[PDB]
Design goal:
This protein is of the alpha+beta class. 19% of the residues lie in helices and 23% in strands. Belongs to the HDGF family.
Length: 93
Amino acid sequence: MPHAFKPGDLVFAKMKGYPHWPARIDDIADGAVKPPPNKYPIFFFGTHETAFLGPKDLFPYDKSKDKYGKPNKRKGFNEGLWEIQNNPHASYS
């Protein structure tokens, strides 16, 4: 059965106005800004942006890839597909 989301989990993450996007749940570095309560830090592959999102916007990658893991016109999306599939745990700083 499902656990709660943890750092390192891979997802497609949904933001208003964008397609479901390949992403991971990030760690918070020592000394770094924490997310609001109930939110997770989401690192979006390809764009390398971070936003804070709740579970309602988080779709487990294995379950969802057949639906959402298709090329898209948007900036950074296809790069993001490569990253999530080929090196999802790398440092992208």
